[PDB]
Structures are given as C-alpha cells and as structure tokens.
Amino acid sequence: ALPQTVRIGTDTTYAPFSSKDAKGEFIGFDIDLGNEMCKRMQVKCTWVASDFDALIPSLKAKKIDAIISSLSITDKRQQEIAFSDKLYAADSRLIAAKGSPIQPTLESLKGKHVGVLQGSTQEAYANDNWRTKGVDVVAYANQDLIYSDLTAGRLDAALQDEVAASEGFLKQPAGKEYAFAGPSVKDKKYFGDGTGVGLRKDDTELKAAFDKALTELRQDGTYDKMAKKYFDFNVYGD
Ligand SMILES: NC(=[NH2+])NCCC[C@H](N)C(=O)O
C-alpha cells in the first residue's frame, strides 16, 4: 500500500544537495537520489520545497510523505520520525574569512557572530555549546542568507555541513576569500551518523521500499555514477 504519489520535501538552499536552477527546477544530489529511488520503487514522486525547520513538522502532519534534504540521522530525531539507511555522510565544519584566527573553540568564538541554519543539528550544537557562553549565535531561515551575511561582513563565521560549504560556497566565485576555520567538529551526540530519508514511524512499507531501492542502486554502481557528477571523493563515507 505505497501511495501513488510520494510527496518529498526538501529545502532548496543547500547546494550541491538541493537547490533550484535558473528556470526554478529542483537540482542536486538529493534530488538525483530521490528520483532514482522513486524510479526503482515504481512510484510517482512530487518534490515540495520548504524551509528546513518546517520539514519534520510537515512530515508529521502528512503534508509530505518523506524528507530528503541532508537530514542527518540523530538519536533525537529518531524519537520523532524513522529514517531509511544512510544516503551519505555529513560532517560539520566552520567557515570564516581566509586568514581568520578563528577556530571552532569557545575562547576563539566568544563575542563573535556565528550563523547557523534554524532547525539544524548545527543550531542545536551552537545553542547549547556556544550561545550560552557568550558567542553571538544567529539562527537563519535558510543557508543562502548565511552566506550573504558572511560576505557582507555581518557574520564572522558560519557552521553548516562541510561538503555543502565546500562545494556550495568555497569552490564558488562568492567563497573565494573564505576558508574552513579549523577541522570538522566531531560530536556524535549532536551530528548523528550520515543523512537519510526521514519518514513517519508507522510508514514501514515505505521505509522498506526506499531501503530496497537504495541497496539496488548502490549495488549496480548507479550511486557512484551519480555521485561523480558532483564529487571527486567518496561522499558516502563508508
Ligand atoms: N537542505 C538543508 N537545508 N539541509 C540542512 C542539513 C543540515 C544538517 N545536516 C541537519 O540535518 O540538520
């Protein structure tokens, strides 16, 4: 009993995983993966754009049926929703201006303005660890706003997924003067283990269909054909 049309929510301001092209078509690695999996599930799929923090609310209220949006699989989120198997890995890392002394440490960040996406694992981490101790942590409605304010000099740093900052900003014209500030911030408690399709806890049939399709496209080498369009390293981790 899978629906005829599976409605998939995503936030299109997180290139190279999810954004929109010049005509306003959805593009990116999350979109490619979702469409391949729908093709193997033999369902029809509609993509529904949303703000990142509205995705899990819309899922719970049945306005969409699945979330593919670099949604990290964390212990907190599993208390609310279910997840497919891992689609790819996702570490977190700070970016600041090139030459910045900034490190991902309280002592370095106290009194700085750090941008984080509202609803993200990074907002959770920064609020507990940094906002309480005097770092000016600013939550943003979407990631594009964060990159804008950083280049505007309104932010000193921004915490987001590492590959999104890399491919989506630092290797782009806009990010030429910026760089990663320190190594990735590892914290198992906050950042989870890779990303997956978020689904309602009771939609086990739909979880099984996505997992079967993900295993099939990984097995035959499709995942890697698709990943190579965007990455030259192994995005899956392993
Ligand atoms: N399309 C997006 N905005 N994705 C943001 C993902 C950020 C982080 N991985 C999280 O799960 O909270």
Side-chain angles (χ1 to χ4, degrees), residues 1-3 5-109 111-175 178-187 190-227 229-238:
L2 295 201
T5 304
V6 176
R7 295 174 50 72
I8 309 180
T10 194
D11 161 59
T12 53
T13 60
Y14 224 63
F17 292 111
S18 191
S19 47
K20 284 190 153 178
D21 71 7
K23 323 177 199 74
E25 286 283 285
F26 290 79
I27 52 165
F29 189 51
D30 281 355
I31 308 302
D32 296 336
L33 284 173
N35 285 159
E36 185 63 28
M37 287 192 286
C38 300
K39 174 188 186 144
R40 299 183 186 229
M41 290 158 74
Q42 305 167 260
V43 295
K44 286 290 183 279
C45 284
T46 298
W47 289 90
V48 180
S50 166
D51 282 349
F52 188 69
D53 72 337
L55 292 176
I56 287 164
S58 297
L59 182 68
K60 281 200 274 165
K62 304 185 75 153
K63 303 190 187 175
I64 52 175
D65 304 300
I67 297 167
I68 307 175
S69 199
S70 289
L71 195 66
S72 302
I73 303 162
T74 63
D75 172 22
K76 259 196 69 179
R77 280 176 180 164
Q78 303 235 229
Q79 306 321 295
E80 286 176 291
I81 63 175
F83 288 93
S84 68
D85 291 321
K86 185 172 97 168
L87 297 185
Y88 46 82
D91 280 316
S92 282
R93 200 164 173 184
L94 278 183
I95 58 185
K98 283 173 155 53
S100 183
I102 288 187
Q103 281 302 302
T105 65
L106 182 58
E107 22 296 294
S108 194
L109 292 173
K112 303 300 186 173
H113 311 288
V114 179
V116 287
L117 177 64
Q118 193 165 51
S120 64
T121 57
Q122 287 85 14
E123 175 187 34
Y125 182 90
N127 280 166
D128 289 348
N129 297 287
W130 295 342
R131 190 187 128 78
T132 50
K133 307 298 163 157
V135 176
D136 180 45
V137 170
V138 192
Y140 284 73
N142 69 73
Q143 187 64 208
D144 281 343
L145 290 165
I146 293 178
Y147 295 139
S148 302
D149 270 14
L150 185 77
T151 57
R154 299 196 192 134
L155 297 172
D156 303 298
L159 190 69
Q160 55 289 301
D161 289 349
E162 188 174 345
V163 184
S166 178
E167 301 302 334
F169 181 66
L170 297 187
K171 289 161 74 166
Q172 301 308 316
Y178 293 90
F180 282 130
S184 333
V185 181
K186 295 298 208 295
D187 193 310
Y190 289 94
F191 298 123
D193 195 17
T195 66
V197 187
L199 301 148
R200 283 183 291 273
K201 287 191 175 168
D202 54 297
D203 276 355
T204 55
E205 194 188 334
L206 183 62
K207 176 182 156 57
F210 276 111
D211 287 343
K212 178 173 186 272
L214 184 59
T215 298
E216 293 171 355
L217 69 84
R218 285 192 49 68
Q219 231 300 276
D220 70 4
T222 305
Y223 181 104
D224 298 320
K225 306 290 212 304
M226 295 194 282
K229 172 178 185 180
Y230 308 89
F231 309 116
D232 69 335
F233 52 100
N234 158 236
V235 74
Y236 186 82
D238 233 282

